[PDB]
């Protein structure tokens, strides 16, 4: 399926353990990818002192347009010093692994895969 139904936990940004996918924008795109698939990828949403606090390459979920069965439809931009990689809508957050943090809410999404 070009689209697929997922469920993302939401974390705090001060209980994520494992702060980024990788070392370079493809890395970080192609983990991002795997660990949506696995279902081991969270969800930190980004306000003031978020993104300080994790590491780049940041791989960021956006709203690819405007909402089936109330999951948002989304698609991947990695972002490297101020360059970003893809081009798509409102950043709903930046995405983690996920290694067993306890989440504070679910984000519904139909991931463009």
């Known amino acids: 399926k070009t689209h697929v139904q997922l469920s993302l936990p939401v974390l705090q940004v001060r209980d994520v353990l494992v702060r980024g996918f ?3 924008v493809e890395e970080v795109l192609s983990e991002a990818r795997q660990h949506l698939k696995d279902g081991t990828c969270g969800l930190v949403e980004v306000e003031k002192g978020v993104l300080p606090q994790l590491e780049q390459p940041y791989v960021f979920i956006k709203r690819s347009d405007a909402a089936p069965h109330g999951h948002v439809m989304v698609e991947l931009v990695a972002e490297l010093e101020g360059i970003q990689y ?3 809508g409102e950043t709903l957050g930046v995405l983690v692994p996920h290694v067993g943090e306890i989440p504070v809410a679910y984000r519904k999404v139909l991931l463009r895969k």
């Open 86 to 88: 893809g081009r798509s």
């Open 22 to 24: 990788g070392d370079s």
